[PDB]
Design an enzyme around this catalytic site. Structure first.
Site, PDB file in Angstrom:
ATOM      1  N   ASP A 283      -7.951  -6.473   6.053  1.00  0.00           N
ATOM      2  CA  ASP A 283      -6.747  -6.909   5.361  1.00  0.00           C
ATOM      3  C   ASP A 283      -6.305  -8.297   5.785  1.00  0.00           C
ATOM      4  OD1 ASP A 283      -6.750  -4.417   4.221  1.00  0.00           O
ATOM      5  OD2 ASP A 283      -5.293  -3.593   5.634  1.00  0.00           O
TER       6      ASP A 283
ATOM      7  N   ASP B 214       0.833  -1.188   0.000  1.00  0.00           N
ATOM      8  CA  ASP B 214       0.000   0.000   0.000  1.00  0.00           C
ATOM      9  C   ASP B 214       0.874   1.246   0.000  1.00  0.00           C
ATOM     10  OD1 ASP B 214      -1.378  -2.322   1.417  1.00  0.00           O
ATOM     11  OD2 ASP B 214      -3.090  -1.002   1.069  1.00  0.00           O
TER      12      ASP B 214
ATOM     13  N   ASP C 226      -2.740  -3.401   7.112  1.00  0.00           N
ATOM     14  CA  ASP C 226      -2.848  -2.763   8.420  1.00  0.00           C
ATOM     15  C   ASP C 226      -4.277  -2.650   8.939  1.00  0.00           C
ATOM     16  OD1 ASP C 226      -3.608  -0.864   6.511  1.00  0.00           O
ATOM     17  OD2 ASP C 226      -3.035   0.795   7.827  1.00  0.00           O
TER      18      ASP C 226
ATOM     19  N   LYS D 127     -16.614   5.973   0.463  1.00  0.00           N
ATOM     20  CA  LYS D 127     -15.806   7.169   0.166  1.00  0.00           C
ATOM     21  C   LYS D 127     -16.538   8.474   0.485  1.00  0.00           C
ATOM     22  CE  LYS D 127     -13.341   4.268  -2.840  1.00  0.00           C
ATOM     23  NZ  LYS D 127     -12.154   3.442  -2.488  1.00  0.00           N
TER      24      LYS D 127
HETATM   25  N1  LIG Z   1     -11.666  10.721   6.302  1.00  0.00           N
HETATM   26  C1  LIG Z   1     -12.092  10.824   4.943  1.00  0.00           C
HETATM   27  N2  LIG Z   1     -13.275  11.546   4.621  1.00  0.00           N
HETATM   28  C2  LIG Z   1     -13.699  11.649   3.261  1.00  0.00           C
HETATM   29  N3  LIG Z   1     -12.915  11.010   2.204  1.00  0.00           N
HETATM   30  C3  LIG Z   1     -11.684  10.259   2.544  1.00  0.00           C
HETATM   31  C4  LIG Z   1     -11.281  10.162   3.836  1.00  0.00           C
HETATM   32  N4  LIG Z   1     -10.167   9.450   3.867  1.00  0.00           N
HETATM   33  C5  LIG Z   1      -9.864   9.093   2.598  1.00  0.00           C
HETATM   34  N5  LIG Z   1     -10.807   9.602   1.785  1.00  0.00           N
HETATM   35  C6  LIG Z   1     -10.877   9.457   0.300  1.00  0.00           C
HETATM   36  O1  LIG Z   1     -11.481   8.094  -0.069  1.00  0.00           O
HETATM   37  C7  LIG Z   1     -10.292   7.269  -0.667  1.00  0.00           C
HETATM   38  C8  LIG Z   1     -10.333   5.761  -0.176  1.00  0.00           C
HETATM   39  O2  LIG Z   1      -9.837   5.651   1.192  1.00  0.00           O
HETATM   40  P1  LIG Z   1      -8.430   4.921   1.447  1.00  0.00           P
HETATM   41  O3  LIG Z   1      -8.597   3.431   1.288  1.00  0.00           O
HETATM   42  O4  LIG Z   1      -7.958   5.226   2.830  1.00  0.00           O
HETATM   43  O5  LIG Z   1      -7.330   5.461   0.337  1.00  0.00           O
HETATM   44  P2  LIG Z   1      -5.824   5.961   0.695  1.00  0.00           P
HETATM   45  O6  LIG Z   1      -5.710   6.223   2.152  1.00  0.00           O
HETATM   46  O7  LIG Z   1      -5.537   7.259  -0.061  1.00  0.00           O
HETATM   47  O8  LIG Z   1      -4.717   4.809   0.234  1.00  0.00           O
HETATM   48  P3  LIG Z   1      -4.305   3.502   1.113  1.00  0.00           P
HETATM   49  O9  LIG Z   1      -2.748   3.088   0.757  1.00  0.00           O
HETATM   50  O10 LIG Z   1      -5.318   2.218   0.733  1.00  0.00           O
HETATM   51  S1  LIG Z   1      -4.450   3.880   2.979  1.00  0.00           S
HETATM   52  C9  LIG Z   1      -9.249   7.872  -0.234  1.00  0.00           C
HETATM   53  O11 LIG Z   1      -8.147   7.660  -1.142  1.00  0.00           O
HETATM   54  C10 LIG Z   1      -9.679   9.448  -0.224  1.00  0.00           C
HETATM   55  O12 LIG Z   1      -9.726   9.964  -1.592  1.00  0.00           O
HETATM   56 MG   LIG Z   2      -4.962   3.521   5.145  1.00  0.00          MG
END
Ligand SMILES: Nc1ncnc2c1ncn2[C@@H]1O[C@H](COP(=O)(O)OP(=O)(O)OP(O)(O)=S)[C@@H](O)[C@H]1O
Ligand SMILES: [Mg+2]
Ligand SMILES: CCCCCCCCCCCCCCCCCC(=O)OC[C@H](COP(=O)([O-])OCC[N+](C)(C)C)OC(=O)CCCCCCCCCCCCCCCCC
Ligand SMILES: CCCCCCCCCCCCCCCCCC(=O)OC[C@H](COP(=O)([O-])OCC[N+](C)(C)C)OC(=O)CCCCCCCCCCCCCCCCC
Ligand SMILES: CC(C)CCC[C@H](C)[C@H]1CC[C@H]2[C@H]3CC=C4C[C@@H](OC(=O)CCC(=O)O)CC[C@@]4(C)[C@@H]3CC[C@@]12C
Ligand SMILES: CC(C)CCC[C@H](C)[C@H]1CC[C@H]2[C@H]3CC=C4C[C@@H](OC(=O)CCC(=O)O)CC[C@@]4(C)[C@@H]3CC[C@@]12C
Ligand SMILES: CC(C)CCC[C@H](C)[C@H]1CC[C@H]2[C@H]3CC=C4C[C@@H](OC(=O)CCC(=O)O)CC[C@@]4(C)[C@@H]3CC[C@@]12C
Ligand SMILES: CC(C)CCC[C@H](C)[C@H]1CC[C@H]2[C@H]3CC=C4C[C@@H](OC(=O)CCC(=O)O)CC[C@@]4(C)[C@@H]3CC[C@@]12C
Ligand SMILES: CC(C)CCC[C@H](C)[C@H]1CC[C@H]2[C@H]3CC=C4C[C@@H](OC(=O)CCC(=O)O)CC[C@@]4(C)[C@@H]3CC[C@@]12C
Ligand SMILES: CC(C)CCC[C@H](C)[C@H]1CC[C@H]2[C@H]3CC=C4C[C@@H](OC(=O)CCC(=O)O)CC[C@]4(C)[C@@H]3CC[C@@]12C
Ligand SMILES: *[C@@H]1O[C@H](CO)[C@@H](O[C@@H]2O[C@H](CO)[C@@H](O)[C@H](O)[C@H]2NC(C)=O)[C@H](O)[C@H]1NC(C)=O
Ligand SMILES: *[C@@H]1O[C@H](CO)[C@@H](O)[C@H](O)[C@H]1NC(C)=O
Ligand code: NA
Ligand code: NA
Ligand code: NA
Ligand code: NA
EC number: 7.2.2.13
Lengths: 976, 294, 32
Positions: A674, A329, A670, A440
């Site tokens: 997962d 990741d 993490d 999201k």
């Molecule tokens: N707290 C939040 N509130 C609204 N949108 C969020 C938030 N956190 C993340 N996002 C968006 O939604 C996407 C999907 O969440 P995540 O899985 O955490 O992606 P990421 O953290 O950028 O990459 P990883 O390596 O999987 S943690 C994110 O990439 C952001 O574009």
């Molecule tokens: Mg994350």
């Protein structure tokens, strides 16, 4: 026994130390920790140290020397009873056979104890942590210090520290596979279900996990008193070694029996034949090669945990070294995970970063309604607050609770546009939806304090391309202008030159729930979806930078050199992921996807052949509509693959697809979900700092610092053990030809015997006890990350090349170096070499006391046996001298020792120990009657120097030929 | 089993997993490798043989006091026979006859090799030096008649036919060695015999105390009347410079042995050079067990 | 005398070398 689930909260006042709020007491914590014990657990009793010592001293292959010593003492007793002149030379043989097993038993016990002491020290390195609500306020503790009558809180992913009783739950579902076996998440609540504390919605148990939700509960049972507390192997590299020892045991037993039945034909007086049999079979089997593996594995783990890479079993160490694919990741692993705000976008305008420590800088704070509205969205969509004790620093230095991507824009709207506690002062709270990676979104409903816009407003943020279809009507200059295709073109171009810098972007919107239907007094609910989530009012984008870790672009190069595929699996947009991968160097400078080569030729995308593009970016929604044959052909033609907008459930499909192409996969995870991907990959890597408990319960190793470079140094440390084992195996096998060929030349050419049994045991004891174990501490070479990953079904430890190098080439020079010293001593005392051919029968006749030498002199029997035992002594010394050069050449495989150095100190101690033992066994007084080893002239010590030099010169020149001409004939036939 | 795959293919022609042009190279490598190893071994042996003299050994301290042996070459220091049985003592007589071939008077007639040293014991005769400057050195000739009643000019069974057997004692050859007989302080050695300044003395007694009452009379035969080795031989010059050298002998006869008992006899030689050992029971000394069955 | 060869001098030298080569190995091993 009956647990206190049937009694309600009033009896929970009247069963424990009067606490159901505000913590228990920090002082009473020491009281109950004094009254009862810590919250520990030990079901293994012990097995004591003396039985482990007796297993080593009397074990396998060391009982042969015990029965040999028993036979020597028995023969001495029969001689001392029934005859005159007892001639105690069968007593000294018995004490020599006693001393040899005592020394080897103490050495192997010391090695096993030193390995076990390291192995029972990886406890207390990442200790458990429990969240209690002590009098003070919500502290984490060492989790063996939880007491009865204490109140803990468990969120999603945490392990239950002790047996609980649920007080206030927000949707905990737990997984009771510790005691039921069912892996279905069952709900927990302060409601009552069954009159039995095993099948209720009440009390949760020790060693379980809330996989979701957050619940507070009181502690009832600690330590070895709970429901689960009461009622409660062979590494694949050790299997190859202990299978190879079986074949060497077969060859040694055949040689020993075949030599034993020939010793009796040459009239050896049965005890000497039996001791010769025992000495051959003991010297030809490398039993001490079994502890070396345990020294090589365990020490390797001790080198890994100092590089922030903590393995959980010893089987993970040897499978880390053969990794072929790393699926990692991005946020937290490849990047530092400390976001700062830069480059906002609203009113068709990319603004500046707003980073100056002076207000109204170059370009911000054109106070329209747009910026105060977007700041309202940035403040009212957050669940993160500043922690306590922070009115001492202002902005850049505070500590914020919550995640990073929310705290980052919290740190921006405190600089300008007032405070955020001001925004909690202004607006109200009703309900919220927490962000999850399957929606999201993050929306919240709020009441305005004023009636300027009397309608009640909801605020919303999330991923911008998923927000925009819902939140449609753009508020540009405080207006409600509808959509145009050029408005979406401006949005797409803005997102292009915002993601091109490698920046994370979020999107923001709001709706004004009109009070034409529902008045100002109107209670509201959310999971009853009775509010519009469509056609809201979009505002604009806010982007954040995320700087890569400083050691990552060298680690990606070291992965590229070693032939390791790296797959980035994110949850971000395919623009930001592509820019970050071009930044750190995943997508290399020279490879291109299909899109940039379609754009540089100005041709549409459904005409280009997807075989000149070595790189790929796979969207996460397209991965659902890929069949299992449509997936692995993307894992075959492209070398640099990046998966974007990928849900953490889709990681398991990628792991299985990579494994179906014949690979060893290391996978970083993490989270709670997962865990299917972690116990399916060949190496599961959990995170240590920002990691759950379910993740680090299901992983093979833990990253102590959450860094991608530490995985690569773990791959280097895993790669070191195969080299260090091959070098030790190549060293131990070279001393078998000098221990065998003297008897063959003694029986074929009929010369007096060049080497006896006692000196065979001395050779083997010294030169195979200490320097064989010294080769496990050898450092790395210059090109360990320059070779392909080993295929652990085709590359074995023992080749044909290894056997032919150890037996066929080095062992023969080592035998000739001793035979030269034999002929030197016998020629200088009076027996020239051609005279010795055919002398064996008269030399060993006890009643011929005038045997003529080359000069005509006549020799008594005991006069010539002393010359023969001097020859035995110098055979042992010459074998020590050539084993010096053998140990020096075995420490590298293709580098030379001039570009490697002599930094191994165990090896230098082994050299000095060899030489000191050989000098003391010869020049000590009293060795002539016990060992029958006699002193050497000083000029006889330099007889084996040409053969040591010949070994050194030949093995340096062969490695130079291997380095200069790779893939040549010499690398085919001599590279073991 | 695994037939027809790891033995022969004929779709790649790979006997034992190696094609025929690959079997040639891996055998040529080992032929050349062992050829150079044999060459280096022979060369180091040849070089070490240049430091070795051909007249004198490099080290002589492991033969330094010589041994003392007896000529009926027997098997456990045991002599046992019946005098009225000519098949029990035949091997002993055959051994003595095969040893005393070169000591005959007709085998010493070549007057350019052999020389006539005196018939009384004399001082050692230095033949020069170990430097090949005079060629072959002459040897003193030993007459068989000095072993009278023990030679083959009489009873040809050497006494074994008539009871009383006889052995022949000799001292082992050591190159360059000159034996020093003891001094004449009249207290030095044991117990009493006739002393001569040019004779290394030998004495044969009984070992235990019941053997001294049963060994009877012991006769000696040698050059002169003092029993021992004469000194006008020694120190011997090696078999390059002195082939056909004849070491001096001493015959010992046991004329009044006690019948049907095993008698242990110890023969010792005395001198300043001559030393004894406790493990080597043949150095400067020997012992024999005689048992005349009747 | 070509028959003597005192072994006590080489024995003294060999035991001095054994003590030296043992203590230097002890100081190389325990240098950590
Ligand atoms: N707290 C939040 N509130 C609204 N949108 C969020 C938030 N956190 C993340 N996002 C968006 O939604 C996407 C999907 O969440 P995540 O899985 O955490 O992606 P990421 O953290 O950028 O990459 P990883 O390596 O999987 S943690 C994110 O990439 C952001 O574009
Ligand atoms: Mg994350
Ligand atoms: C009584 C007489 C005594 C004769 C002299 C004693 C010498 C014999 C000792 C050698 C035997 C030791 C070999 C053990 C093999 C271990 C099995 C194993 O796991 O290997 C797997 C491997 C498996 O192979 P692989 O996985 O490595 O790769 C493929 C190899 N092929 C194609 C062959 C299958 O098998 C082998 O090791 C093949 C062995 C080939 C022979 C190696 C050369 C040996 C030369 C030694 C003789 C030199 C002279 C000896 C002294 C004579 C002088 C007087
Ligand atoms: C005094 C000691 C100090 C010096 C020690 C010398 C150590 C040198 C030992 C290793 C060197 C071996 C030389 C091999 C050179 C051939 C490699 C090559 O050129 O590749 C292309 C050539 C051509 O083959 P190829 O590379 O093309 O391989 C064929 C593969 N196809 C068909 C696909 C192309 O290699 C060979 O064919 C050489 C094979 C013959 C093997 C050597 C012949 C005998 C000579 C070896 C004697 C070794 C002396 C040992 C004596 C030491 C005594 C202790
Ligand atoms: C690795 C193992 C198999 C080798 C150990 C056995 C020895 C190498 C054998 C093999 C043949 C033996 C010997 C057979 C006879 C020759 C004569 C010899 O010739 C000379 O050097 C002097 C001849 C002269 O000057 O006239 C050369 C070596 C030697 C002693 C050989 C030395 C090695 C011997 C003892
Ligand atoms: C460990 C492997 C290499 C085998 C040993 C290699 C040697 C070269 C072998 C091969 C055959 C052996 C011997 C067998 C036959 C004898 C007869 C010999 O002729 C004699 O004059 C011997 C006189 C006697 O025995 O009475 C000279 C060569 C020799 C020593 C050979 C020398 C070399 C030996 C020891
Ligand atoms: C010498 C190098 C190639 C090896 C490096 C490690 C070894 C421990 C070195 C240190 C000094 C070397 C040697 C220098 C000379 C002595 C003479 C030797 O003693 C004698 O000279 C015999 C007579 C006497 O001891 O008095 C004791 C061992 C020896 C070979 C030493 C053994 C150890 C050597 C090979
Ligand atoms: C390495 C190959 C390719 C070439 C061989 C060169 C070696 C250095 C040669 C030169 C002289 C040879 C040897 C000659 C005599 C032997 C035994 C010994 O010499 C003596 O016996 C002399 C003693 C004395 O007479 O006082 C000590 C040196 C040694 C080991 C020498 C070791 C080195 C040898 C084999
Ligand atoms: C051991 C392999 C790896 C290399 C071989 C090293 C030596 C060259 C070996 C090979 C065979 C051995 C010997 C076996 C046969 C004898 C017979 C010998 O002839 C004799 O003088 C003995 C008969 C006689 O004339 O009385 C001359 C060569 C010699 C010493 C050979 C010399 C070389 C030996 C020591
Ligand atoms: C009888 C002889 C032939 C057997 C032992 C010979 C060894 C090959 C000798 C030769 C010189 C010795 C060493 C002398 C000190 C240096 C330290 C080292 O120097 C460095 O520059 C290392 C720098 C680094 O740490 O990277 C390189 C190897 C080494 C040469 C040598 C390795 C090999 C030694 C033990
Ligand atoms: C050597 O042997 C001869 C006979 O072979 C011995 O001579 C006889 O000895 C006995 C002993 O009493 C005498 O009675 C005879 O008269 C002797 N005969 C002759 C012809 O001399 C002689 O004694 C032996 N020598 C010894 C024992 O020293
Ligand atoms: C042998 O004869 C001698 C005669 O001088 C006599 O003194 C001696 O005691 C005899 N020995 C035996 C064992 O009869
Ligand atoms: Na062993
Ligand atoms: Na796993
Ligand atoms: Na070895
Ligand atoms: Na061995």
């Amino acid at each position: 026994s009956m647990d206190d689930h049937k009694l309600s909260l009033d009896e929970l006042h009247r069963k424990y130390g009067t606490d159901l709020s505000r913590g228990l007491t920090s002082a009473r914590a020491a009281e109950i920790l004094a009254r009862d014990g810590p919250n520990a657990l030990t079901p293994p009793p012990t097995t004591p140290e003396w039985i482990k010592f007796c297993r080593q001293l009397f074990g396998g292959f060391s009982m042969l020397l015990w029965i040999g010593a028993i036979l020597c003492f028995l023969a001495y007793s029969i001689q001392a009873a029934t005859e005159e002149e007892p001639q105690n030379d069968n007593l000294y043989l018995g004490v020599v056979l006693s001393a040899v097993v005592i020394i080897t038993g103490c050495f192997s016990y010391y090695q096993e104890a030193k390995s076990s002491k390291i192995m029972e020290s990886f406890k207390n390195m990442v200790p458990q942590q429990a969240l209690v609500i002590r009098n003070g306020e919500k502290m984490s503790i060492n989790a063996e210090e939880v007491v009865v009558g204490d109140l803990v809180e468990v969120k999603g992913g945490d392990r239950i520290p002790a047996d609980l009783r649920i007080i206030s739950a927000n949707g905990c579902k737990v997984d009771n596979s510790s005691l039921t076996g069912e892996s279905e998440p069952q709900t927990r609540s302060p409601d009552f279900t069954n009159e039995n504390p095993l099948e209720t919605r009440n009390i949760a148990f020790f060693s379980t996990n809330c996989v979701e939700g957050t619940a507070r509960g009181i502690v009832v049972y600690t330590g070895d008193r709970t429901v689960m507390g009461r009622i409660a192997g062979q590494t694949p590299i050790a299997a190859e070694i202990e299978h190879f020892i079986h074949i060497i045991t077969g060859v040694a037993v055949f040689l020993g029996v075949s030599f034993f039945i020939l010793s009796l034909i040459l009239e050896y007086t049965w005890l000497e034949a039996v001791i010769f049999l025992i000495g051959i079979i003991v010297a030809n089997v490398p039993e001490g090669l079994l502890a070396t593996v345990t020294v090589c594995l365990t020490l390797t783990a001790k080198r890994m945990a100092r590089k922030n890479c903590l393995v959980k079993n010893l089987e993970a160490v040897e499978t880390l070294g053969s990794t072929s694919t790393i699926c990692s990741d991005k946020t937290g692993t490849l990047t530092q995970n400390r976001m700062t705000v830069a480059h906002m976008w609203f009113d068709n305008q990319i603004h500046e970063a707003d980073t100056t420590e002076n207000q109204s800088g170059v370009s911000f704070d054109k106070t329209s309604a747009t910026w105060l509205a977007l700041s309202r969205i940035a403040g009212l969509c957050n669940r993160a607050v500043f922690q306590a004790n922070q009115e001492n620093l202002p902005i850049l230095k505070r500590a914020v609770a919550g995640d990073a991507s929310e705290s980052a824009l919290l740190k921006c709207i405190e600089l300008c546009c007032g405070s955020v506690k001001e925004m909690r002062e202004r607006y109200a709270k009703i309900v919220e939806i927490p962000f999850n990676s399957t929606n999201k979104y993050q929306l919240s409903i709020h009441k305005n304090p004023n009636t300027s816009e009397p309608q009640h407003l909801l605020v919303m943020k999330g991923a911008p391309e998923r927000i925009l279809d819902r939140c449609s009507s753009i508020l540009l200059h405080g207006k409600e202008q509808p959509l145009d295709e050029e408005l979406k073109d401006a949005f797409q171009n803005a997102y292009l030159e915002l993601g091109g810098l490698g920046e994370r972007v979020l999107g923001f919107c709001h709706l004004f729930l009109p009070d034409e239907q529902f008045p100002e007094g109107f209670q509201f609910d959310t999971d009853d979806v009775n509010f519009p989530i469509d056609n809201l009012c979009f505002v604009g984008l806010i982007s954040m930078i995320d700087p890569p870790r400083a050691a990552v672009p060298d680690a990606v190069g070291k992965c590229r050199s070693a032939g390791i595929k790296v797959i980035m699996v994110t949850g971000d947009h395919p623009i930001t992921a592509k820019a970050i991968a071009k930044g750190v160097g995943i997508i290399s400078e020279g490879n291109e996807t299909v899109e940039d080569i379609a754009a540089r030729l100005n041709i549409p995308v459904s005409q280009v052949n997807p075989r000149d593009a070595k790189a790929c970016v796979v969207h996460g929604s397209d991965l659902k509509d890929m069949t299992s044959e449509q997936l692995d052909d993307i894992l075959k033609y492209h070398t640099e693959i990046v998966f974007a907008r990928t849900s953490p459930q889709q990681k398991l499909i990628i792991v299985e697809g990579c494994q179906r192409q014949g690979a060893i996969v290391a996978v970083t995870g993490d989270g709670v979900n997962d865990s299917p991907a972690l116990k399916k990959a060949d190496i599961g890597v959990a995170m240590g700092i920002a990691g759950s408990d379910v993740s680090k319960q299901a992983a093979d190793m833990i990253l102590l610092d959450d860094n991608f470079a530490s995985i690569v140094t773990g791959v280097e440390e895993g790669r070191l053990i195969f080299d260090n084992l091959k070098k030790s195996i190549a060293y131990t096998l070279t001393s078998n030809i000098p221990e065998i060929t003297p008897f063959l030349i003694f029986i074929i050419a009929n010369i007096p015997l060049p080497l006896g049994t006692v000196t065979i045991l001395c050779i083997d004891l010294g030169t195979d006890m200490v320097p064989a174990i010294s080769l496990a501490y050898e450092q790395a070479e210059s090109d360990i990350m320059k070779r392909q990953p080993r295929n652990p079904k085709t590359d074995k430890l023992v080749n044909e090349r290894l056997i032919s190098m150890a037996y066929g080439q080095i062992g023969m020079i080592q035998a000739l170096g001793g035979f030269f010293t034999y002929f030197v001593i016998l020629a200088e005392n009076g027996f020239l070499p051609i005279h010795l051919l055919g002398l064996r029968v008269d030399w060993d006749d006890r009643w011929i006391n005038d045997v003529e030498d080359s000069y005509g002199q006549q020799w008594t029997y005991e006069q010539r046996k002393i010359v023969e035992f001097t020859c035995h002594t110098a055979f042992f010394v010459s074998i020590v001298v050539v084993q010096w050069a053998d140990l020096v050449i075995c420490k590298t495989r293709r580098n030379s020792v001039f570009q490697q150095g002599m930094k191994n100190k165990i090896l230098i101690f082994g050299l000095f120990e060899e030489t000191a033992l050989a000098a003391f066994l010869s020049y000590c007084p009293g060795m002539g009657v016990a060992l029958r080893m006699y002193p050497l002239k000083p000029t006889w010590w330099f007889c084996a120097f040409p053969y040591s030099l010949l070994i050194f010169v030949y093995d340096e020149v062969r490695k130079l030929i291997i380095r200069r001409r790779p893939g040549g004939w010499v690398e085919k036939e001599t590279y073991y | 089993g695994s037939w027809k795959k790891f033995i022969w293919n004929s779709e790649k022609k790979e006997f034992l997993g190696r094609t025929g042009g690959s079997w040639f190279k891996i055998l040529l490598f080992y032929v050349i490798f062992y050829g150079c190893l044999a060459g280096i071994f022979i060369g180091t042996i040849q070089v070490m043989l240049l430091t070795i003299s051909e007249f004198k050994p490099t080290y002589q301290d492991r033969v330094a006091p010589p041994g003392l042996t007896q000529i009926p070459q027997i098997q456990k220091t045991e002599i046992s026979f019946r005098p009225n049985d000519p098949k029990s003592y035949e091997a002993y007589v055959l051994n003595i006859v095969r040893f005393l071939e070169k000591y005959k008077d007709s085998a010493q007639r070549d007057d350019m090799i052999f020389e006539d040293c005196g018939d009384v014991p004399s001082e050692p005769k230095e033949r020069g030096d170990f430097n090949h400057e005079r060629g072959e050195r002459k040897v003193c000739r030993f007459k068989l008649e000095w072993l009278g009643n023990c030679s083959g000019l009489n009873d040809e069974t050497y006494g074994y036919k008539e009871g009383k057997p006889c052995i022949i004692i000799k001292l082992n050859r050591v190159l360059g060695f000159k034996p020093k007989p003891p001094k004449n302080e009249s207290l030095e050695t044991y117990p009493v015999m006739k002393y001569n300044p040019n004779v290394l003395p030998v004495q044969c007694t009984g070992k235990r105390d019941e053997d001294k009452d049963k060994v009877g009379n012991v006769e000696y035969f040698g050059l002169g009347n003092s029993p021992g080795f004469p000194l006008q031989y020694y120190p011997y010059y090696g078999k390059l410079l002195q082939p056909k050298y004849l070491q001096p002998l001493l015959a010992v006869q046991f004329t009044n042995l006690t019948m049907d008992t095993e008698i242990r006899i110890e023969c010792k030689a005395y001198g300043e050079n001559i030393g004894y050992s406790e493990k080597d029971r043949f150095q400067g000394r020997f012992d024999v067990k005689i048992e005349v069955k009747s | 005398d070509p028959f003597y060869y005192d072994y006590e001098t080489v024995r003294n030298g060999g035991l001095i070398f054994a003590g030296l080569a043992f203590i230097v190995g002890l100081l190389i091993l325990l240098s950590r």
